[PDB]
Amino acid sequence: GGSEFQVRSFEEIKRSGEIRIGTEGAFPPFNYFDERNQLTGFEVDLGNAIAERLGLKPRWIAQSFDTLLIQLNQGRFDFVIASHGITEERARAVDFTNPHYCTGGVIVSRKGGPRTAKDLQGKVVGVQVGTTYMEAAQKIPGIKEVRTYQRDPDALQDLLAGRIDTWITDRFVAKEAIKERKLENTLQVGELVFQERVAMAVAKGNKSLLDALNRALAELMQDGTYARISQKWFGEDVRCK
Numbered sequence: 521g522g523s524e525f526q527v528r529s530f531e532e533i534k535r536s537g538e539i540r541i542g543t544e545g546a547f548p549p550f551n552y553f554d555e556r557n558q559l560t561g562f563e564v565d566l567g568n569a570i571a572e573r574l575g576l577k578p579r580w581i582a583q584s585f586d587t588l589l590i591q592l593n594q595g596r597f598d599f600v601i602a603s604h605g606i607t608e609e610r611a612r613a614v615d616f617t618n619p620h621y622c623t624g625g626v627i628v629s630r631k632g633g634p635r636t637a638k639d640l641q642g643k644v645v646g647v648q649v650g651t652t653y654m655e656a657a658q659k660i661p662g663i664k665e666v667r668t669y670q671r672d673p674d675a676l677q678d679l680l681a682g683r684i685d686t687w688i689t690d691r692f693v694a695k696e697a698i699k700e701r702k703l704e705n706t707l708q709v710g711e712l713v714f715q716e717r718v719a720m721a722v723a724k725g726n727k728s729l730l731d732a733l734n735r736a737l738a739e740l741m742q743d744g745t746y747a748r749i750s751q752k753w754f755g756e757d758v759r760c761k
């Protein structure tokens with residue numbers, strides 16, 4: 521049905537009483553569609569909690585990962601929460617909040633397969649488009665072929681099928697996919713290639729909303745709500761530092 525695109529200040533959002541949140545929905549357990557086809561995950565629970573702390577009704581918009589930061593700047597939504605690591609290149613285009621979790625990227629292979637970056641010379645490596653995983657693979661240039669996917673779970677499918685040697689993805693995403701599919705004797709998590717701080721994003725220059733999100737996040741972190749949502753999803757506290 522389309523929508524009115526606008527980069528909205530915090531007070532413009534408050535007048536409307538609803539906050540528009542962009543996410544992907546193909547990155548379990550952070551943001552994904554469940555078995556009854558409803559949007560859920562750690563970041564959805566956290567997004568909802570942020571909206572509530574700002575006195576706002578959340579309206580969720582799911583779309584392809586590579587589109588998110590473009591449509592944010594175009595005004596499709598007010599903020600994005602979809603597991604973006606903070607990087608210098610992205611910060612040119614969007615403003616990041618303080619990070620809502622810390623993580624890193626790992627090499628995942630079948631048992632006996634490549635464990636570390638130096639082992640990827642001559643191999644086929646699968647990554648999601650526009651990710652810090654793709655960037656890491658582009659920095660391991662002895663790779664025979666970097667196969668890039670629109671959706672991260674498709675790279676995993678190709679790993680299991682033998683079409684790639686190695687999948688580079690989030691450490692929590694890899695751990696859960698292995699538990700979830702009972703792959704403990706099939707796949708092998710190797711080197712932590714890099715660490716990253718993961719944050720919400722607002723349109724470039726949208727400082728009023730940026731400040732309001734940071735205030736809400738700090739409030740969730742002090743009032744136990746963040747700790748509760750992190751326990752629910754991970755059985756541990758996943759906050760930075």
Ligand SMILES: NC(=[NH2+])NCCC[C@H](N)C(=O)O
Binds near residue numbers: 545546604648690718
């Ligand atoms: N919703 C998603 N599929 N997100 C992928 C994010 C992956 C990685 N943390 C990055 O910053 O690029």
